[PDB]
Design a protein around this motif. Sequence first.
Motif, PDB file in Angstrom:
ATOM      1  N   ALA A 117      54.145  40.545  38.461  1.00  0.00           N
ATOM      2  CA  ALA A 117      53.827  41.009  39.807  1.00  0.00           C
ATOM      3  C   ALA A 117      53.184  42.395  39.761  1.00  0.00           C
ATOM      4  N   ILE A 118      53.844  43.344  39.104  1.00  0.00           N
ATOM      5  CA  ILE A 118      53.274  44.675  38.911  1.00  0.00           C
ATOM      6  C   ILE A 118      51.866  44.613  38.306  1.00  0.00           C
ATOM      7  N   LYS A 119      51.699  43.818  37.256  1.00  0.00           N
ATOM      8  CA  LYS A 119      50.421  43.768  36.563  1.00  0.00           C
ATOM      9  C   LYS A 119      49.345  43.085  37.404  1.00  0.00           C
ATOM     10  N   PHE A 120      49.738  42.106  38.219  1.00  0.00           N
ATOM     11  CA  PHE A 120      48.800  41.428  39.125  1.00  0.00           C
ATOM     12  C   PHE A 120      48.299  42.353  40.229  1.00  0.00           C
ATOM     13  N   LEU A 121      49.241  42.953  40.942  1.00  0.00           N
ATOM     14  CA  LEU A 121      48.951  44.024  41.881  1.00  0.00           C
ATOM     15  C   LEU A 121      47.883  44.964  41.326  1.00  0.00           C
ATOM     16  N   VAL A 122      48.226  45.652  40.243  1.00  0.00           N
ATOM     17  CA  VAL A 122      47.345  46.632  39.617  1.00  0.00           C
ATOM     18  C   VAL A 122      46.163  45.971  38.899  1.00  0.00           C
ATOM     19  N   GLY A 123      46.112  44.644  38.938  1.00  0.00           N
ATOM     20  CA  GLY A 123      45.060  43.914  38.257  1.00  0.00           C
ATOM     21  C   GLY A 123      44.953  44.257  36.781  1.00  0.00           C
ATOM     22  N   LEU A 124      46.072  44.181  36.067  1.00  0.00           N
ATOM     23  CA  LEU A 124      46.057  44.303  34.614  1.00  0.00           C
ATOM     24  C   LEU A 124      46.197  42.923  33.994  1.00  0.00           C
ATOM     25  N   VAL A 125      45.854  41.903  34.776  1.00  0.00           N
ATOM     26  CA  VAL A 125      45.929  40.522  34.326  1.00  0.00           C
ATOM     27  C   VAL A 125      44.555  40.023  33.890  1.00  0.00           C
ATOM     28  N   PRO A 126      44.508  38.832  33.281  1.00  0.00           N
ATOM     29  CA  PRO A 126      43.224  38.278  32.848  1.00  0.00           C
ATOM     30  C   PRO A 126      42.453  37.656  34.008  1.00  0.00           C
ATOM     31  N   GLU A 127      41.138  37.844  34.001  1.00  0.00           N
ATOM     32  CA  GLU A 127      40.268  37.248  35.007  1.00  0.00           C
ATOM     33  C   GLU A 127      39.145  36.456  34.349  1.00  0.00           C
ATOM     34  N   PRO A 128      39.503  35.362  33.655  1.00  0.00           N
ATOM     35  CA  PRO A 128      38.529  34.511  32.965  1.00  0.00           C
ATOM     36  C   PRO A 128      37.381  34.117  33.888  1.00  0.00           C
ATOM     37  N   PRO A 129      36.215  33.782  33.311  1.00  0.00           N
ATOM     38  CA  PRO A 129      35.054  33.404  34.109  1.00  0.00           C
ATOM     39  C   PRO A 129      35.186  31.970  34.595  1.00  0.00           C
ATOM     40  N   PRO A 130      34.163  31.462  35.292  1.00  0.00           N
ATOM     41  CA  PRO A 130      34.105  30.052  35.695  1.00  0.00           C
ATOM     42  C   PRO A 130      33.568  29.148  34.583  1.00  0.00           C
ATOM     43  N   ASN A 131      34.392  28.209  34.127  1.00  0.00           N
ATOM     44  CA  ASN A 131      33.978  27.264  33.095  1.00  0.00           C
ATOM     45  C   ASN A 131      34.113  25.819  33.564  1.00  0.00           C
ATOM     46  N   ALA A 132      33.078  25.021  33.319  1.00  0.00           N
ATOM     47  CA  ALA A 132      33.053  23.632  33.765  1.00  0.00           C
ATOM     48  C   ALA A 132      33.020  22.668  32.586  1.00  0.00           C
ATOM     49  N   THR A 133      33.746  23.009  31.527  1.00  0.00           N
ATOM     50  CA  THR A 133      33.795  22.181  30.327  1.00  0.00           C
ATOM     51  C   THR A 133      34.671  22.816  29.250  1.00  0.00           C
ATOM     52  N   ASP A 134      35.167  24.014  29.535  1.00  0.00           N
ATOM     53  CA  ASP A 134      36.025  24.726  28.608  1.00  0.00           C
ATOM     54  C   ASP A 134      37.264  25.232  29.343  1.00  0.00           C
ATOM     55  N   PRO A 135      37.975  24.325  30.032  1.00  0.00           N
ATOM     56  CA  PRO A 135      39.229  24.672  30.713  1.00  0.00           C
ATOM     57  C   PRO A 135      40.113  25.498  29.787  1.00  0.00           C
ATOM     58  N   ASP A 136      40.015  25.180  28.502  1.00  0.00           N
ATOM     59  CA  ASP A 136      40.685  25.916  27.441  1.00  0.00           C
ATOM     60  C   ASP A 136      40.430  27.415  27.519  1.00  0.00           C
ATOM     61  N   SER A 137      39.203  27.788  27.863  1.00  0.00           N
ATOM     62  CA  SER A 137      38.811  29.194  27.919  1.00  0.00           C
ATOM     63  C   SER A 137      39.393  29.915  29.125  1.00  0.00           C
TER      64      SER A 137
END
Lengths: 498, 498
Positions: A117-137
């Motif tokens: 929660a703290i890290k999400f608030l402060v946005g210290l979380v991951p923000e992966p890009p949009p992938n349409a074939t690499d859900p893995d990524s």
Amino acid sequence: VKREHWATRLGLILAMAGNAVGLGNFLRFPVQAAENGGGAFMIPYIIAFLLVGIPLMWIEWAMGRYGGAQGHGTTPAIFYLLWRNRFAKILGVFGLWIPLVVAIYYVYIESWTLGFAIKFLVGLVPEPPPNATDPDSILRPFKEFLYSYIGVPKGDEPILKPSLFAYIVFLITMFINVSILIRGISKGIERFAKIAMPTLFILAVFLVIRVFLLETPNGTAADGLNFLWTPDFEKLKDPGVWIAAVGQIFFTLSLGFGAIITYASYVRKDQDIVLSGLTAATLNEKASVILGGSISIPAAVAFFGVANAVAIAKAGAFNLGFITLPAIFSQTAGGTFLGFLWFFLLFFAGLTSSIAIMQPMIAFLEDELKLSRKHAVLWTAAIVFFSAHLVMFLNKSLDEMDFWAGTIGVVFFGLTELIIFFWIFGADKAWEEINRGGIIKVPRIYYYVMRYITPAFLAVLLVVWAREEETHWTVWITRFYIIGLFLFLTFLVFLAER
Amino acid sequence: VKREHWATRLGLILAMAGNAVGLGNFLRFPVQAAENGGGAFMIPYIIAFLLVGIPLMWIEWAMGRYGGAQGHGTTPAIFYLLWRNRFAKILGVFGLWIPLVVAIYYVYIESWTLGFAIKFLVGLVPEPPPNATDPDSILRPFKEFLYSYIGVPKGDEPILKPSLFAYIVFLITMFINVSILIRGISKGIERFAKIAMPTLFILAVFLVIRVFLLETPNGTAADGLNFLWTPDFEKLKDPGVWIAAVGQIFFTLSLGFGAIITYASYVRKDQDIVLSGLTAATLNEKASVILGGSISIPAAVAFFGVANAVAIAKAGAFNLGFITLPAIFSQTAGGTFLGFLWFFLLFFAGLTSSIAIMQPMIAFLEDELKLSRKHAVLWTAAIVFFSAHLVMFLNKSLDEMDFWAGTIGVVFFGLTELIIFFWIFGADKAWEEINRGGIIKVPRIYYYVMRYITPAFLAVLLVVWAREEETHWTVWITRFYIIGLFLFLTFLVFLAER
Ligand SMILES: CCCCCCCCO[C@@H]1O[C@H](CO)[C@@H](O)[C@H](O)[C@H]1O
Ligand SMILES: CCCCCCCCO[C@@H]1O[C@H](CO)[C@@H](O)[C@H](O)[C@H]1O
Ligand SMILES: CCCCCCCCO[C@@H]1O[C@H](CO)[C@@H](O)[C@H](O)[C@H]1O
Ligand SMILES: CCCCCCCCO[C@@H]1O[C@H](CO)[C@@H](O)[C@H](O)[C@H]1O
Ligand SMILES: CCCCCCCCO[C@@H]1O[C@H](CO)[C@@H](O)[C@H](O)[C@H]1O
Ligand SMILES: CCCCCCCCO[C@@H]1O[C@H](CO)[C@@H](O)[C@H](O)[C@H]1O
Ligand SMILES: CCCCCCCCO[C@@H]1O[C@H](CO)[C@@H](O)[C@H](O)[C@H]1O
Ligand SMILES: CCCCCCCCO[C@@H]1O[C@H](CO)[C@@H](O)[C@H](O)[C@H]1O
Ligand SMILES: CC(C)C[C@H](N)C(=O)O
Ligand SMILES: CC(C)C[C@H](N)C(=O)O
Ligand code: NA
Ligand code: NA
């Protein structure tokens, strides 16, 4: 005889609902539901609730209030009061042991939510890009985020390595529990429930609503609710469906943890427990089936499709709650904020629960060893904080405690409290106590459902799966420690005898 | 009853000598002596005895008898009596912790000796043939015998696997300790000392004599005694010679274990402790230097030569006592019987010690928590028997406990009891108490040797080696548990406050 008592009916009810409506309702229920086929689950779940959840709860409230009037809020004393015998006190120890042990991994998991929660608030979380074939990524980044948080072994040695931030957040989390508990039942546990339960509800509904609107090329939230609530009368005879169910009813409702009993011990000698209990139970079933059930699964189904769903459930309760969902949200608009609400919701749901399973030990120290609340609270904090190091550092230590205390133990204890109350103590005397002061009365039929059905139902369970041999040498470390805790709680019980 | 008291002076003395004259004198001393060069050891050993062993003992007897008259035989209560303060009670906890922890691996080793003795008697031991070029073929068999007994890891995982016979013999051994302790100071610990100490002596002398006559192509027992008792005034400035020494004086004399204090707490308020103490101490120095010193080393030197000797000592205290010696005896006439006496000697020597380090916990439970002796004894048995499982199954768990409790802890505690008595309490008041009822009186000089020398001496030690952090991840398991024991003993101390 002092002992604290709920300040108000609503305060009580909500505390009790907060007792039950925890990480279980949100992280665990969804997984149990989708694991067995979904529609195969909701039905046995409800029955077990009617046939086990209800009967067992009224019993615990009754034993709790019964002991409360005599100065005792824990089961070593209570079990002995109803059933004069030495073996009574010994079995009673599980009502200190189970909560203690569960508390020992629970508060740690609870602390994760806070940390995210703290890290999400402060946005210290991951923000992966949009992938349409690499859900893995999109999962990979989130997968690495949790692993780095708890220090998941990258080689082999079954050794965890929490981050400094994870560790420090654990301290904060423990401190928060203490700050609450150290104020007592009303001015603490009660005050907090009145604030937390409504908060928790609004967050929960919001997410429910917002998840409902989810739709991708692979499915819709609607499809997930369908998968959950569309019956499958076939399997429904394969009774692993009644093991997950009856078993889930315990954790979800906090049955067999000694906790419902302890809280109830504060209820006045003549306050209602028939309606109050029924109300709280029901709030819990609502929170699970409507709330808990309608978030993670429908979201996962929305993004992954209904078939790639049962598999995700099988992946476990931590994948979904801490990896998959955050990964999904990261692909929806204002999803970083959706993760925050989710984890803040889980946190408050965890907190209202952790304080519940820490009270039995606190109540025992006050009731039987005559400690001041401050001390009773701090020593319990010390034992939990110290013991949790085993959970933070030793791989699968959590699984082992969850199994013996949180899964097996509760059931055996459920069945044990019932036998001592409705058989040894006197089915008739129990039925009267349970109904005494009742704003409403228990539908008679239930008398036969607890004196024969419930106990039979449980016996069959404990027998079925028990029908059916090695494992990492480390499980023995955890098994050693928790057996040690028992020896120790038993010793304390022995000391309270003079 | 105001607590038990030694039945007779001799009974007392011998119990006390049995307190000190243990597996340490026979398994450990010989190794320390030959490790550092032999003649380099005997001198610093004696000085340390005069400058630390003596002063410290009189102190412990004094604190013991002082507390005894006031109903208290352990250091949380005693430390507080001499030094009114909260931190007094906390430091006092080490006088419960150190004995407890040491007891937790000690009684296990003690049980080995019993197990070998039984197997030697019945001749279930190895009887390798005569080899004049494959000494390996004579040790190998014996090496495999011990490893199979304790379940020494053959692969890697730091996991032991005791034999059923080892495990069962541990039970028997625990039972024997209980059967003794459960009878009390006089009718139990005292009765047993009067039988055991003489027995132990005769066995010891016999072996000493019989080992003296040892002679092979590679050397003579005579050469071993020479190696031990021929000085080397060079090294004698390298002070690892004064670390092994001062340190050995603690274990050998049971100093810094809270044990001397507990026993002394039974001595009547006005019984002599100056002569009695001095007598017992001396019996111990005799048992070590004459007895302990003249068996294993001279035998090993006789068979292996004086150079192949320092290496064998470096191999460790278990190789020599449990592998090498039995291998040597197997090559001498009526050697199977020589192994039996040896291990029976070690057993009786272990037994008279293990009961000593189990009494502090037993005394505390009676004195402070007001338990009956039966209970105090059985609960202490439970905690020791349970905890020893860590020692039986987890590789290097023994080493870790031996280090923190048996090596470091004793020294720090030695220095701590001294400071509280001869500084905080009042050097003058301490000197008087120590001399009160003295059949003889303490040579004045000593007053300055405990008020400045002894404490300085120890400070220098704790400073020197402390002058100068990874290791198997398993040490952390043992470290976790024993820290847990402390938290727990502290909690019990907290409970004795009302
Ligand atoms: C307190 C409410 C949440 C309890 C979660 C406990 C779930 C423990 O579940 C465990 O998760 C592990 C890691 O995925 C798996 O290896 C184990 O098979 C599984 O038992
Ligand atoms: C009260 C019991 C104390 C047991 C020792 C706790 C040691 C905590 O150790 C901490 O753990 C964190 C997670 O690995 C690390 O980030 C830090 O390096 C470390 O300070
Ligand atoms: C399995 C029982 C739980 C105890 C595990 C404690 C983990 C110890 O962790 C250690 O802490 C030290 C000091 O904090 C640091 O010097 C080291 O970096 C670290 O290895
Ligand atoms: C197995 C438990 C079933 C729960 C459903 C019980 C619903 C209540 O049932 C009612 O109870 C009343 C009082 O007993 C009776 O007057 C009625 O016969 C009955 O309809
Ligand atoms: C008299 C009491 C007997 C116990 C003392 C012997 C226990 C010492 O044990 C030894 O510790 C050493 C240092 O860690 C290691 O090098 C050796 O492998 C180990 O045998
Ligand atoms: C309180 C003790 C908790 C752990 C349970 C101890 C069970 C050990 O028990 C025994 O160990 C022996 C030696 O390995 C084996 O010979 C036997 O198979 C086993 O019964
Ligand atoms: C510090 C760990 C102490 C616990 C002792 C663990 C001893 C293992 O216990 C043994 O394991 C065997 C195989 O799993 C089983 O066959 C036996 O039932 C059991 O005695
Ligand atoms: C290193 C400390 C060794 C102390 C040895 C003390 C030997 C006895 O020393 C004696 O003590 C008597 C009483 O004080 C005096 O009367 C004598 O003059 C003195 O020789
Ligand atoms: C252990 C219990 C207090 C957990 C809680 N009942 C839940 O559903 O999460
Ligand atoms: C722990 C102590 C009782 C040990 C004993 N003094 C010995 O030398 O073996
Ligand atoms: Na909750
Ligand atoms: Na001894």
